[model samples]
Target chain A: ASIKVIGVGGGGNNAVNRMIENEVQGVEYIAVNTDAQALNLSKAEVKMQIGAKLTRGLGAGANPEVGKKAAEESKEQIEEALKGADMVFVTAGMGGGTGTGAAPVIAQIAKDLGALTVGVVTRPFTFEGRKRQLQAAGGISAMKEAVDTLIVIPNDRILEIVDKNTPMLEAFREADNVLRQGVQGISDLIATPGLINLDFADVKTIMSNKGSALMGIGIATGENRAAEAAKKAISSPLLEAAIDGAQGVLMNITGGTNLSLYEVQEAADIVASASDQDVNMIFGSVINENLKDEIVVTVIATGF
Target chain B: ASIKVIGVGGGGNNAVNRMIENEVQGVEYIAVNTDAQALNLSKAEVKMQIGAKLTRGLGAGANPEVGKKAAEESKEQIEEALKGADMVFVTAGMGGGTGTGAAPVIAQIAKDLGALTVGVVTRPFTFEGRKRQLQAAGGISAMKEAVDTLIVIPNDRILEIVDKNTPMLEAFREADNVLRQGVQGISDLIATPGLINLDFADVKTIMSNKGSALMGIGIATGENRAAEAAKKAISSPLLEAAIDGAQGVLMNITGGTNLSLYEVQEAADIVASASDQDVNMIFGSVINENLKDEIVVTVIATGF
Candidate 1:
């Protein structure tokens, strides 16, 4: 029933508030950096979400290093705004200097405020150049220890998730889409079917004070030969060890076939037959496709 | 109706056979490095279960270093043992150099053999000297990686589980008791009136392929606390996240009264509430018990 999102800036001042305003769904947007000019091109429609007092130096220019200092100064304001937030996801293009340095700390503040904070951080591509890549990587190492989880969609992994090359802003859109699913997932859970929708405190047990259970799934129709592709997908080292010290189970079948159910049953057989562990109980589903030659079994032993 | 169990020596020979003889219900013991004397030892066992085969490398001078090689050799024998085995468990002690080192390799062989090789490994106590402690830690690491689900009961940790400063060997026996309960858990599930015991093939899917589920439990308590202590157990942290990600969840809570039904209930609440990505259905029950304030929760989060 509650979500509070805080947007910190980078590269330029207005860019942050504008990026967040355009990106997030129901945020109460606010601008603290004093660059009225940059803020001029802002999506201040939800201006009421911003704090009444505006702190200067958050602007892009001559005082480029000021965003970090400004965030530190507005600590109290940031703290109160995050009160009782069940989930807090922070997003920013941090290849730049100040915001990258400070955003993770801000996320921790949200955590300190009792919000489950997740960092959806962006890093510039190395192909773009070294400085930016270094900046992103640095922000990653620094922030990683600080945040619970980071949905790192470095400029490159993005193209792999989507179609042919994507621009930085478009890639940002894809990254944001991932985060959107995260929110939607929460939305679906909160809107439960049974007589109850357990609150965040209960959600705490599901997560158990660990990092937020944010996962990334990439789907692709590679070479139209699922045998190789699906095999390729499930064979990933990540899926290989879904649970530490355990082998991952696989189930696969195609469309137009009554065998889907049968193969799934057989897949259970394979796992039971192959594994040294007792699979006293089992659970999974099948993917039915029109193609019959596409024989592949993928089960990511890697669980977020 | 198969029950597969593997005996991995830390370093030398007779140690494994003795421990297997001392504990474990129905196991076909096999000694890797069988000397003429080791052969004599194997012959003393009952005939209904398979003989403790004396694989090559049974020299009198037993060193733990041979364990890695011995485990590799036992792969075929252990696999043969598991042809129609159920509830496979691997046992080893840190006291011997061979058992500590060889167990990990033996575990992998068992997994390759199509059995749920639950590792019942014994780690060194804090009170132990440096070299043995180091060896135990190494065994723990190797065993930790090879087994499907592991329960870490450091000799030190179990000190509180029982009263008095016990020797490492006795502590290991106590640790074995915990292992038995975990096994009995699956037995209870299959033995229950309505549920069906999975066939070897079904258990295989749970091993690495799909169509499988797991329930891990951990225990911590004092006094005849074995039963009550068992209830406080649940799947390993690794298992919890794996099931959570699969979206296959139906955690059951069962235990005698001395254990905290509420905490068991609390775990159910915890797993259910945050299981947003996981399924929402969970059920629990309590068995009758008369004891002081002792607690054990056997939380099994599985599927239909």
Candidate 2:
């Protein structure tokens, strides 16, 4: 897929772009440090009029003016990006000031234009401080409302998957790599097809499932059933792919089951139980069952 | 734990207040509908004061008018609530246009006024369409940058865990219950233990370790293991019952002699490798032999 990855500047989150770019081999990479007087750092051939903001001084909300600017340009940017793009994976803003401050406006713009916008955000780990954590949370909270899907990579949730003893930077890199792999896996699966993965049509159908159902689950228990095992495997490039590259995450999980018709009825029930909405449908199927006794499970939903 | 769960309705998130109050029981709840109207949806005292077209209409951003107002009243409100609030879970907007819009402004208000704020927000899980999801994403992305400690429970994420086959409303109710249980588990743990879960001083230290160092893990091989002839159990909830409760994560697989630290270390390093700054710290500890076989870990960092 002719994909492009953009890095947003949110002060504390200076290296996210690099991290994601480093992990996800190909695809264009652009970094726009929204620090006042900021320009889109992306050297992409497109003269994308992506307005940048510098919000170090705006304090917590990083000067609402920054967000307002993006909000103002919402429709125009949408039209520009949408011309050739089939999907947009918006990733940025989950730190103090800048990134956290501006992401919402961009996402709002994407939503206004009617594209499948998936926001992938990395929330502040502890070192970034509670204030920043809250800031990232607030920004992401708003972004979730404006996008088709949002995959949150909480820095705090970055453990276990990596070495606890490794320096934090390595840990983050590890996360970026893992995430990139997952994204690529999904991207490849969507771009290419295997016996068990979903395609672009499937991707749209998956995205379309956001139909007031509330929740979705993908459970595969045979190969890797660590809580997130199934999810990671399915989202992997080798197994299945997503509609877009790993740009948005409607849901992230691990551990899949290889059971014969694993009663996914529970997964469907999760949606109705969580959203106060009715279950429209429970879609998705199992992939290749390896030699071991395992299964794969995944689900996505819409409601509440 | 005199908790005050305050809700603001700047961006049509009035519904949030009622929902939050229902799930986060034994707490005060308040909702600010339009800038002009403040409704105490949950059992929280109301402080109503609306000004110019700042916190209403267009969107809650720095209008100079609104920023100044938020700065002035945010402190007073927290100060007033401080009398009864040991911990505050402030919530608000990420929708059509009001409460969530103004919520960030208010959250900053609480932080500036020196109130211990934990931002709990509900992103748009409108389940009906992608528009709300995009809107929710923008709002959340913005908020994540300001709040001190933020825990985002995607209404949709809750769906993945509950009964999906049911009705959406039923799903929502289930999701609310999960949230309530989660909050209660953490709040009760901390409150029942006096100021902190362990000791204020020890917890403060662990908070730094936990808030910044630990990583969350689940489904481990030896989660419920015994020392000698260990039975392999895999459960990962390292964050549970810790200083930060759901926030505290594990650093390495320390319980076993040949722990999976190296493997985990490799995984975590890729996330923040080239940031040109100190990476997040990594802490380590072994599980009680009795619970060593089952690997259930959830991590939250204590902050560097």
Candidate 3:
């Protein structure tokens, strides 16, 4: 499967930077923003500055409308970047101009192309005040309509995910890292299928609902790795609310040839035991030599 | 297949009234509150007012500590009412005294007794202020540890589920109705199995994840009802975020003897199409003579 991840605006570009640092594999990365300065910082495979006519590559000046208009201006570039992708992920930090405005349009373009689209975005912190939060909600509503799945990481949640003394920039990088793992989990699900596999069709079936989703990835290399990985994914603060209100869970286990049905069943059983009695769990497994002794369990948990 | 619904605190008690009005079948309903006056209004099969010594029956007075103490005082009564139930739902509105404090304990007790426990709780509206929201979060965290699945419905969502012109009382009723439908859906799933048959074990396998779960119920009569119900459920605002982030989905179709394999398949297909391609969908069906021409489709979507 051809998968693409696009980062929109300052927020999104930041994530693309992290994706580059993390060396996300087997996928294309694009960074789109209105600020030439930020775009210049990106080492992504592709970079596009939007809304030059309106802002002269300065930025959206914290206005989502400007961001949206700029995305419209760069429609062709955006379309071309998204072309030939089976699944598209649009990432942004909402509340600012380029990210908030352009995210929906970016997602819409991918969806219009019939690609399964997932929007990964953030809502502003309470410290940023009501206006930014409202703007983020508006951007989210738009993205909600445009994408098959939307993953929102609230800015306030950043504090919970990191150390209290961490630097602001570093905290954001941590958040990006979390998003990267989740994104990678999905990529792996499609690119590699083990003994019992989960294909692209299965991914779409789980993600096509019109609600927000929570994604988590866990990896452990030692004995009892299955339990540890399952626990790590379940306990991830980035995905704190992921399973609480979840309606269903699709779990994919990726491991090496040494991966046994017993291990897969162990992970599945642990996941199943933790959920409610009424929850429906779908399990998939794939073998990857590169994974060796390390087993990575990717979970896409969806709910209101 | 035995099921029980317990309402803890004033907000929770309010929901039980709605369940009583709906005449939920094959489930024992209990109302627990700190306020005696509120208890009197409940027509649930059983009612218990706690904090007689602490609040002197005046209520928890917004103090969760006091609510916890009151529940401690009434532990035996709570346990008695909860006994013999295989599945228990603890419903509450966080930020208040009884709901926040007692709900977790109630869930813990039922869980200790080996019943699969799910918590249906609500977060306060934004207007309720930071303290209340913080309080609700605290309560939710506690419940998260005690319950198999926690279903959180944000009170602010009332703004979206209802119209601006909706009356205050009616708006609450609407919220309660949503909860009622969700609770009823679970009741239907276990109390009866459909033609295709997804038993309690299947339900548990899906719901036993360590995260929260989302529940949606849809009803339709006559032509294309199966599709309509599945679509309506997939699109329900009560569960707007339910399936989008969902990893898998468990669907139960409660139909009359007139239900067909084609209808079952149609509903299953529509649900599958609405969900992500990766989502694993498990379907169940049961015949309800009382349903006649009506079909109720209940779905439990889990995500992390």
> What RMSD does each model have against the real structure?
30.5, 22.7, 29.0
What level of docking quality does candidate 3 show? incorrect
Considering summed lDDT, which 10 consecutive residues are worst modelled in model 1 chain A?
A: A47-56
Per-residue CA lDDT of model 3 for A56-90, tens digit only, reads: 54457668999999999989989988899999989
The true-versus-predicted C-alpha distance at residue B27 of model 3, in Å, is 1.4
Best by lDDT: 3
Backbone clashes under 3 angstroms, per model: 64, 214, 64
TM-score of chain A of 1: 0.56
Better-scoring candidate (lDDT), 1 or 3: 3
After superposing candidate 1, which stretches have Cα over 4 Å from the reference? A1-304, B10-63, B73-76, B165-169, B191-267, B270-295, B299-304
lDDT of 1 by residue, B93-165 (tens): 4634455656677667666666666665555555544666776767777776777654334445556656686
Scored by Cα lDDT, where does model 1 land? 0.44
Best by DockQ: 2
Q: Pick the candidate with the highest TM-score.
A: 3
lDDT of 2 by residue, B1-304 (tens): 4655555543222333334443433555554433221121122345333332233211234332343354344445445554555455565435434334455666565565555555655554545246546655665655555566554545555454446675433443443343343334334334332111332223333332122222223334542222211111112122222223233322323233334554344323421231113433233233333443443223333332
In candidate 3, what are the lDDT values of residues B9-58, reduced to their tens digit?
75677677777765666788888876543454355658677766565444
